[PDB]
Amino acid sequence: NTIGARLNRVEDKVTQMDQRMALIT
Amino acid sequence: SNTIGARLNRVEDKVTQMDQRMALITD
Amino acid sequence: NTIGARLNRVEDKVTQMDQRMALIT
């Protein structure tokens, strides 16, 4: 897959883990 | 070893493992 | 912005959150 595609996928994922975080801690 | 591409690789590895450990912290 | 800054910002975020998880497990 493309770097453009991969980069986007990781920016959102980090964003998702951050929200799972926020709801706990 | 340090192109945007090689570093992307590392950052997705870290993200992958981090996402699992996370299932142990919360849903 | 650029692909470089975007990768930097994401490394930045991943790093901050790893230290937060490292405290727990």
B4-8's contacts with Cβ under 8 Å and 24+ in sequence apart are B4/A3, B4/C3, B4/C4, B4/C7, B5/A3, B7/C7, B7/C11, B8/A3, B8/A6, B8/A7, B8/A10, B8/C7
Among B13, C25, B19, C5, CA closest to A15: B19
* Experiment type: X-ray
Query: Residue-wise over C1-25: b if at least 16 C-beta within 10 A, else e?
Result: eeeeeebeebbebbeebeeebeeee
Q: B6 in contact with A at a CB cutoff of 8 Å?
A: no
Resolution of this entry, Å: 2.5
The chains in contact with chain B, meaning 3 or more Cβ pairs closer than 8 Å, are A, C
DSSP letter assigned to residue B7:
H
Provide the token pair at A3.
Answer: 């770097």
The chains in contact with chain C, meaning 3 or more Cβ pairs closer than 8 Å, are A, B
